[PDB]
Paper text:
The first-generation backbones corresponding to these designs were assembled with the Rosetta BlueprintBDR application and had similar cylindrical shapes. On the lipid-exposed surface, design calculations favored Ser and Thr in close proximity to a glycine kink where they could form a hydrogen bond to the β-strand backbone, effectively mimicking the backbone-water hydrogen bonds observed in strongly bent β-strands of water-soluble β-barrels. As previously observed for eight-stranded TMBs, a delicate balance between the optimization of tertiary structure energy and negative design (introduction of locally frustrated residues) to disfavor premature β-strand formation before membrane insertion was critical for the expression of the larger TMB nanopores in E. coli inclusion bodies.
pmcTransmembrane β-barrel (TMB) nanopores formed by a circularly closed single β-sheet provide rigid scaffolds for the transport of molecules across cellular and organelle membranes. Encouraged by the success in designing these narrow TMBs, we reasoned that de novo protein design should provide a general approach to creating robust β-barrel nanopore scaffolds for a next generation of nanopore sensors. We set out to develop general methods to overcome these challenges and design stable monomeric channels with tunable pore shapes, sizes, and single-channel conductance.
Author numbering: 5 to 147
Write the structure that this text describes.
């Protein structure tokens, strides 16, 4: 249930960040999954940051699921990630989506969820931020 994970992000303006956190996921319904996570992030530009996010996956079809992520950070920055996850293979799925903020300017992104071995799942996120930069993140969790 509770998986420790580490995030590693790089942006086209050479701003990097490393995060450490845990995620506990529950199954509220047979086609509905919820998740809560908290992490500590160290950044190139803003030093330290703490973020708390809630996730949810709702089955839309046999291999499609609606994913939502709500995140708020200690620097008073928040966002909303809404994506549709398509399961391609038993250990492979893609989830193109968009990030929302009160500052508007919806930011498109894509997640690639794959399992590197039995006890490791990796989530690769490629997002296009509102500052015209591109951020590539690598999330590794211990299954």
């Amino acid at each position: 249930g509770t998986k420790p994970y580490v995030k590693v992000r790089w942006n086209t303006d050479n701003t990097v960040a490393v995060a450490f956190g845990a995620e506990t996921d529950y199954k509220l319904a047979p086609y509905l999954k919820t998740g809560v996570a908290t992490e500590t992030e160290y950044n190139n530009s803003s030093l330290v940051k703490t973020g708390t996010e809630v996730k949810t996956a709702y089955r839309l079809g046999p291999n499609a699921a609606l994913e939502t992520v709500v995140r708020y950070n200690t620097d008073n920055t928040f966002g909303v990630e809404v994506a549709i996850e398509y399961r391609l293979e038993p250990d492979l799925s893609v989830a193109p989506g968009t990030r929302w903020n009160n500052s508007s300017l919806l930011a498109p992104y894509i997640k690639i969820k794959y399992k590197l071995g039995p006890d490791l799942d990796v989530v690769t996120t490629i997002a296009y931020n509102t500052d015209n930069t591109v951020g590539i993140e690598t999330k590794v969790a211990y299954k």
